[PDB]
Amino acid sequence: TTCCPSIVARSNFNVCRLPGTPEALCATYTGCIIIPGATCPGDYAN
User: Fold this and answer.
1) How far apart are alpha carbons 41 and 31 in whole angstroms?
2) How far apart are CA 7 and CA 37, in angstroms?
3) What's 8's domain CATH number?
4) Which residues, in sequence order, are CB contacts of 19 under 8 Å at separation 6+?
5) How many domains does the chain have?
6) Residue 41 and residue 20: Cα distance in Å, rounded?
7) N- to C-terminal Cα separation, the chain
8) How distant, in Å, are the alpha carbons of 15, 25, 43, 44 from that of 29?
9) CA dihedral 3, 34, 32, 17 (to 10 degrees)
10) Cβ atoms within 10 Å, residue 5
11) Is 36 exposed, middle or buried (0-12, 13-18, 19+ CB in 10 A)?
12) How far apart are CA 41 and CA 15, in angstroms?
């Protein structure tokens, strides 16, 4: 599951993913994170 720290970060995440870039690369490039669970925390609420 991915979790993002803000709106901007999620929007940029989603653009990063359009060409098929691995989630892990899009995470370091945006500040979003990948977790094994399904419940994103309150500081990664977007």
Assistant:
1) 14
2) 21
3) 3.30.1350.10
4) none
5) 1
6) 26
7) 12
8) 11, 6, 17, 15
9) -100
10) 16
11) exposed
12) 23
- Resolution (Å units): 0.5
DSSP bridge pairs for 2: 34
Tokens 């925390």 — which residue? 41
What is the amino acid identity at position 6? S
What is the span of the domain harbouring residue 22? Answer: 1-46
Distance between CA atoms of 35 and 33, rounded to whole angstroms? 7
Three-state SS across the chain? CEECCCHHHHHHHHHHHCCCCCHHHHHHHHCCEECCCCCCCCCCCC
Q: Are 29 and 16 in contact (CB under 8 A)?
A: yes
